Amino acid sequence: DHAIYTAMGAASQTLNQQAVTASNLANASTPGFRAQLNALRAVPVDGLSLATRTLVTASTPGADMTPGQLDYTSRPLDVALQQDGWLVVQAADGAEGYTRNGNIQVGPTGQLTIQGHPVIGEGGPITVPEGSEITIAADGTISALNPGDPPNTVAPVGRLKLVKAEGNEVQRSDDGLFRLTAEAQAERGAVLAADPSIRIMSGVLEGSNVKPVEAMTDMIANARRFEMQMKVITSVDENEGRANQLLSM
Amino acid sequence: ISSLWIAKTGLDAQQTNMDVIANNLANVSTNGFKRQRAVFEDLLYQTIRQPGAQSSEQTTLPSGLQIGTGVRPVATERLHSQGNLSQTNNSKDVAIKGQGFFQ
């Protein structure tokens, strides 16, 4: 009689997985987006008799850090990272997070920032001259040229801080900025250290890694699974309703 | 169901992006025009179940889940680059280099 509960739980988790897939498909064009992997997880109920009821609860692993594809925009301050590079920026709460959205912008007061959040380098957030043109090197050097001044006065005015996370130990926070897991940050320190083995490319921008074939296959599988679970639900309901009349005289 | 109200946001973002592209293509002959480029952002994620214990002498994958919320058009930037110069031979036409605007 309780198989209806297992079937409805499976249906609800299928709906959750469908919602995850729809979320991945919707923002398929945001720059520097990481897809949200998902896979059903089994939980067996048991004890003292005939362990048969095994429930299903959907779960989502961290992400797939497969690099997104690069498109050339020729904008001087667009950065594309290596296989597993990250740019570290302070978040709203004041803590640091990691991202790959290379669409840097400069405010009216010489404040560099990715969308919403300022970029950090040596020390606090990096600041450039008031209206200087900015060029980004292949290793993170920010060269500034004051307008009108002759070209022979290009000066380095700071440096980006680049970290290296392999991917299995980073988890997406509530605002889309990745952070190290508990054990990873315990064993590598609260704040990561800059490394030179990471190189950027100026002028190109990174998209998102969403697989249309994977999305379509998951949608088809979820549809079929949900329909099967619904059929099991109605069969069990009809069986119980027909059998309920035994108590009569 | 959240799927409908997520795909609605996806469709809206796509429609606005198409409108921006159409606007850029419409004024392909407007003098002194700077092209538009629309950038979006994913909404804040909603967590349901926190991840459990990990690396406990086992090779299990994490168990937590968090559903998305959709995508919103966050900004639209105009590329203030340098365009080409067309010769009109009219004595009262001015083409400005570098950066600057007439008040």
Binding site: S49, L55 | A53, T60
Partner: peptide, 21 residues
Amino acid sequence: GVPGALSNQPAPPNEAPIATP
């Protein structure tokens, strides 16, 4: 005891954990 029979001790509670520690 065999299923469906009588017993003098209550069954232990059911837990069904998501992931064992």
